[PDB]
């Protein structure tokens, strides 16, 4: 099951983002697109999609058959479109690309009260997930709030990181 995480990591800018995956490092604060198909060869670390609650997406081929090649082959992809809620609610995903840039996908915000791109439910709030501080280092001082809500019939329990 670990073979299904993309591990194409290349710290070409000596920022040390890969080191946070393997060693305990607190975050420094000196510095502080449609969800279709992403090629796994450009991905480093886990791929999270946020159907209200966060879900981990593993490497598959184009049919959706799970592969175990660490995302190294060109056929390995991430089928983000399959994770969309059937009822048409808010949807988004995020991951780290090979050179340490946080990438996001999602519908364009139809208003200040509408959702964001990745795990941004609110312009001020962020869906909490185990790799939040790795992809979003500046949200460390954000406050957590337990959220219960029904969307399309399904109850979703998750936490939101707000200012």
């Amino acid at each position, epitope marked *: 099951h670990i073979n299904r995480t993309a591990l194409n990591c290349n710290d070409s800018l*000596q920022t040390g983002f890969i080191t946070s995956l393997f060693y305990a490092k607190n975050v420094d604060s000196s510095g502080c697109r449609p969800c279709d198909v992403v090629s796994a060869r450009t991905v480093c670390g886990p791929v999270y999609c946020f159907t209200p609650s966060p879900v981990v997406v593993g490497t598959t081929d184009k049919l959706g058959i799970p592969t175990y090649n660490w995302g190294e082959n060109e056929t390995d992809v991430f089928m983000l479109e399959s994770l969309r809620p059937p009822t048409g609610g808010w949807f988004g995903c995020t991951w780290m690309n090979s050179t340490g840039f946080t990438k996001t996908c999602g519908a364009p915000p139809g208003g200040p009260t509408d959702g964001g791109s990745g795990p941004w439910i609110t312009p001020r709030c962020l869906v909490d997930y185990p790799y939040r501080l790795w992809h979003y280092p500046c949200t460390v001082n954000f406050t957590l709030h337990k959220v219960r809500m029904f969307v399309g019939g399904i109850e979703h329990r998750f936490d939101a990181a707000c200012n």
Partner: antibody
Amino acid sequence: VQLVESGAEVKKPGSSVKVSCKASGATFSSFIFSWVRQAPGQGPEWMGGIIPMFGTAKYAPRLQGRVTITADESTSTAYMDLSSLRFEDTAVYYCAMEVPGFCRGGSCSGYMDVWGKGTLVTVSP
Amino acid sequence: AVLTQSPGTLSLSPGERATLSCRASHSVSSSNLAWYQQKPGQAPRLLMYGASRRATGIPDRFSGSGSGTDFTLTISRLEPEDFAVYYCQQYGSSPITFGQGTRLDIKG
């Protein structure tokens, strides 16, 4: 983070030897162990590496067939086993904390931050 | 990627400026090159990573630069503790390699 190793050993030509490294100060499962040896009056030579939670172990091509590197998650102790010892294998054997610069297919490569104190292994009759 | 260091032995006086060079048989991707100091009977101490990023605890006098196939370690003013052997190490290719070392000793 500190890395303690097994004591010095003396072996005969053709025998084998097992060096252990205990990592304290960091989680063992995600630790990147690197084994680097250095013959007297020579430069360091990378032997192989192991990341336990990935299960994959990479080896240097020079002695890819004579070394097996294992990690024991129960006791937090990584092991390096070198078999069919030769006189040219007399060296100090270090374990180290590899800090990754790039990763591919279950393994990573980088620089050595925390070095073990060193384990002398002499091959003599 | 084979690393060749120059000079084999570098002889300088305390207070002088030391420049050690590491040359690679092929280009080192993303300047993945580190530098180590080794005093006799000790394990190598990491000085520099990413060609130019100084390791924590390393004094200001240690400086690194270069890219491609030509890397430089610079000690602006030599202190007595700085006479030792220096190794470079590339981590730009899948089997990492070390240089053969440069001995930095006292000029006479």
